[PDB]
C-alpha cells in the first residue's frame, strides 16, 4: 500500500473547486472573484475559515516559488491530507464523510484502499510540509535566527507554529515506528 | 554560553588515554596492545565495557571515514558528551565526579561554566551522532532498506538501535524547545 502524489496543478484546481462549492453551500449568490478567492472565505464556517485560508496561502506561495513540480505537489498533497485528518479527528462516533469538504479532500487526493499513504509516505509528506511552513515563518527556516517580518501564515484563528510542532511530532513518531518495524523484520527473518 | 568542539585527533587521544587508565585501575599490569585496545576491555566493569567498545568502534570508523575533520570531531564530541550524560544519570544523589571516567570525559571535552553545549549545540551534536550510527546500521542509513549484513555496533550489552531512538528523541525535544523559545522571544520583544 503506497500513495501516488496528485500532480500539483490538478490538485490546486480541485481544492479551489471544493472551496468555491463550500462558499456556495452557505450563499448560493456569492460573487467569486477568481484571483481573490480568499475574500469570499467569510462565507464559510468559523471552523473552516483558517483551513481554507491556509490552503489558499499555501497555493499562492507555491505558485510564487521556484520549486520543481514534484516538490510543489508533495507540499500541497501533504497539507490537504493533514487538514483532512484534522477534520476526521473532530468526528468522535460517526463518519467524517458527513463533511462535504472532507469528502472533497478524499476525492481530490484520489485516496482509496490501494492508494493511501504508508508511514514512509506520511513521514516524507509531513516533513516537506513542516519545512515549507518553517521557510515562511523563520529567517532561513531556522527559528534560532528569529521570525520573518512578514508572516504570510498569520491568519486569524490559526497558529502556524502549533502546526509546525504538531507536524514535527507526527514525523518524529512515524520515524520511530519505521525504525521499530525494521528491527522486528530484522530479528524475525 | 556555547560549546567549541574539541579537535578530533586530540579528543581521540585523550579518550584513548582515559580508557588505558580505566583498564589499569583494575589491573596495573594489563598489557596494552596499542593498535588493539579493545582486547583489554575485559578488564573494566561490565557497565563500562559497552561504553568503551562503542567509543573505540566509533573512533575506528571515523578514522576509516572520508569525513572532514570538523564532522569527525562533531561525532566524537557528541558521543563523549552522550556517554558522560549517561553516567551522570546513574548518580541519583551524589556527584558523578565520583566516577574517574566521568571526570575524564568532562576534562577531554574541556567543559566549563562558559564552554558548555547550548540546546542548539546539543541538537547539532546528537543529530550528527544519530546519523552516524544509522550510517553503520542500515543500508543507505535508511531503516526502510534494512540492516547492513555487517554490524560494527553489534556489541555485547549494547543496543545501537536503542541509542538511535534515544538520540532521535533528544534531538526532537531540543528542536521543540528551540521553537518554543523563539516564539517567546517573538511575542515578548
Numbering used by the authors:
A (entry chain A), B (entry chain A): 1 to 189
Quote the authors verbatim.
Among all bacterial pathogens, Legionella pneumophila maintains the largest known set of translocated substrates, delivering over 300 proteins to the host cell via its Type IVB, Icm/Dot translocation system. In at least nine instances, this regulation is direct—a hallmark of an emerging class of proteins called metaeffectors, or “effectors of effectors”. Through detailed structural and functional analysis, we show that metaeffector activity derives from a diverse range of mechanisms, shapes evolution, and can be used to reveal important aspects of each cognate effector's function. After release into the host cell, translocated bacterial substrates (effectors) regulate one another through several different functional interactions: indirectly, through counteracting modification of a shared host target, or directly through either steric complex formation or direct modification of one effector by another.
In addition to its inhibitory effects on MavQ, SidP synergizes with another effector, Lem14 (Lpg1851), to cause a severe growth defect when co‐expressed in our yeast screen. Strikingly, neither protein confers a measurable growth defect on its own. To explore this further, we solved the crystal structure of Lem14, revealing a small, alpha‐helical protein that forms an anti‐parallel dimer and is structurally similar to another effector, LpiR1, whose molecular function remains elusive (Beyrakhova et al, 2016). A citric acid molecule was found inside a positively charged pocket at the ends of α1–4. Lem14 has a positively charged pocket that is required for SidP‐Lem14 synergy in yeast, as mutants that reverse the charge (inset) alleviate the SidP‐Lem14 yeast growth inhibition. The synergistic effect of SidP and Lem14 is dependent on the SidP phosphatase activity and Lem14's charged pocket. Co‐overexpression of wild‐type SidP and Lem14 caused a sicker than expected growth phenotype in yeast, but any SidP or Lem14 mutant alleviated this effect. While revealing the full mechanistic basis of SidP‐Lem14 synergy remained outside of the scope of this current study, the uniqueness of this pair and its linkage to our earlier work warranted at least some investigation. In contrast to the SidP‐MavQ interaction described above, the synergistic interaction between SidP and Lem14 does not appear to involve a physical interaction as tested by the Y2H assay and LUMIER. Providing further support to an indirect synergistic interaction, we observe clear cross‐species synergy between L. pneumophila Lem14 and SidP from L. dumoffii in our screen. Indeed, together with our suppression data, the observation of SidP‐Lem14 synergy makes SidP a remarkable hub of effector activity within the eukaryotic cell, likely linking SidP/MavQ host lipid modulation with the as‐of‐yet undiscovered function of Lem14.
